[PDB]
Design a protein around this ligand. Structure first.
Ligand SMILES: CC(=O)N[C@H]1[C@@H](Oc2ccc([N+](=O)[O-])cc2)O[C@H](CO)[C@H](O)[C@@H]1O
Ligand SMILES: CC(=O)N[C@H]1[C@@H](Oc2ccc([N+](=O)[O-])cc2)O[C@H](CO)[C@H](O)[C@@H]1O
Ligand SMILES: CC(=O)N[C@H]1[C@@H](Oc2ccc([N+](=O)[O-])cc2)O[C@H](CO)[C@H](O)[C@@H]1O
Ligand SMILES: CC(=O)N[C@H]1[C@@H](Oc2ccc([N+](=O)[O-])cc2)O[C@H](CO)[C@H](O)[C@@H]1O
Lengths: 133, 14, 15, 15, 133, 133, 15, 133
């Protein structure tokens, strides 16, 4: 797929992403906080359509992600992220996608996610997370 | 406070 | 704490 | 060393 | 089990731990680097014996861990870390323990592990990792 | 004066500021690097005019500030920054302004300036620096 | 890129 | 003089140093905090004696240094630190030494001093500070 790297910011305000109940996670677009004001990052599009978009609007300051988790599996022979769950200090943004395959999880005891990078073709191929105090 | 902070990634196994 | 990333800032000069 | 700030990045998931 | 928290240091020089091919990971003792000099942290002992110790001696500066992974499962009615694998930029200290259960992985694209904390009873109940540049 | 706070970014691309050979430093405008692309911060203007502008363009990547220094003194009874000197690993952007009063300096052994904050009235009253690896 | 944790250090004074 | 580098720790519990109202700063010994427990670092002694020791016992967690300042000057032809003032969020450990020469200051708006390095001969030649969150 096409690789992307938003880099680092001061926090996360909103996460918009696609998912399909039969395949996997699609495109991704994150609105970060940059020194007290929103900063809409580049939209990382899937090569295809037919997805269900979900918009997670975090009450910034007070709310922040404490764990990212999901499932990794094969779709059309490609290893991709098929499911994602974001848990904040206020609530859990339930599983989105196909919860089948190999689970993965990044619980954060102390610290904050301040950026995302990865690759997306038809689906989210993989992704990494920027951590910072 | 004067206590240096660290990034700690959640527990695995619980 | 809160979701805001912290930074090291060295005090002001010039008062 | 250069003028580009560094960040901690936790490896990829999905390969 | 008995909780422990080594805190943070400036690197890792050696990692010693127990494992049993039929149960799970046992005790753990880490030798950190503290500003250029070795610092042997407290030995976190298992409540029992019968383990196979393994001593991973890293060639501090050049060599460092780039990924920790393993399996989580039940042993005698308790959820514990049954297996571990430490991958460095030089080699992989192959799977130790029982590789059955739920997989977990913390790959590190950039940054260093500078501390461990967790709990140990009969086996390694769980653990967390301190990360830093 | 009126306070300002640019916040933190990933580096410095340009520093533009005013100075008067008989009074002190005036307005200031910094262009930061934000994940590989520029981010022109807000222009922090002096209350008055009659200044000489200076524009410092850094060879991104390779060039970075290793020390900020200058002079603090009174002008019309107010304690303000009267002179500034930015030394990078490539060269020194010589003294600008009046080099009289009390000298100050922030030499950086390791780390990077990633933001500025302060206050400006007729002249730069004071300023602080964001540091990061 | 080595296993040695880095630190922010602000230049010497008196040198 | 003889160079020294304590490295970095997790905080500061106590600072012991020598001073002479007629010359400059002498020896220095720092007791850091290392993951909750005291860590007495190496004592960096002056080549000579005849100093007045001062012991700054900080109320580690609640109390921490917010600014270090002093004067630099010549003594017997050597440029050394002649005076020091440690300001915390609770009180100011008044100037110690000879407050003559060129002043310097490192005020900290956010962050912590977690280590010292430098050189000492008959007197403190110079020093640097480790900063961290
Ligand atoms: C050339 C290319 O970028 N292919 C990508 C792309 O692969 C394809 C998947 C399906 C078709 N198709 O025609 O059905 C074509 C390419 O998407 C995959 C999953 O996201 C990978 O990113 C794969 O690398
Ligand atoms: C009191 C205590 O600390 N018990 C611990 C201890 O519990 C056990 C008690 C009895 C047996 N047994 O086989 O009889 C095994 C574990 O070890 C467990 C796994 O490490 C847990 O840490 C458990 O909390
Ligand atoms: C109200 C106000 O912001 N005044 C500011 C402003 O004060 C002045 C008022 C009058 C003169 N004057 O020359 O007539 C100069 C500064 O600028 C000063 C130095 O920059 C201070 O910032 C001072 O706080
Ligand atoms: C050899 C040596 O280490 N000399 C040091 C030592 O030098 C002196 C030698 C002789 C006298 N004296 O008064 O005779 C003073 C300082 O102390 C100085 C300031 O602390 C410098 O560190 C100087 O490098």
């Amino acid at each position: 797929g096409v690789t992307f790297d938003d880099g680092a910011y001061t926090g996360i305000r909103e996460i918009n992403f696609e998912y399909n109940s039969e395949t996997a996670i699609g495109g991704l677009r994150v609105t970060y906080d940059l020194n007290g004001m929103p900063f809409v990052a580049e939209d990382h599009k899937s090569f295809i359509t037919g997805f269900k978009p979900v918009k997670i609007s975090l009450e910034f300051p007070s709310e922040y992600i404490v764990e990212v988790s999901g499932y990794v599996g094969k779709v059309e022979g490609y290893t991709v992220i098929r499911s994602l769950t974001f848990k904040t200090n206020k609530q859990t943004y339930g599983p989105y996608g196909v919860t089948n395959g190999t689970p993965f999880s990044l619980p954060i005891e102390n610290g904050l996610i301040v950026g995302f990078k990865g690759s997306i073709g038809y689906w989210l191929d993989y992704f990494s997370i920027y951590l910072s105090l | 406070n004067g206590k240096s902070q660290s990034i700690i990634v959640g527990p695995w196994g619980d």
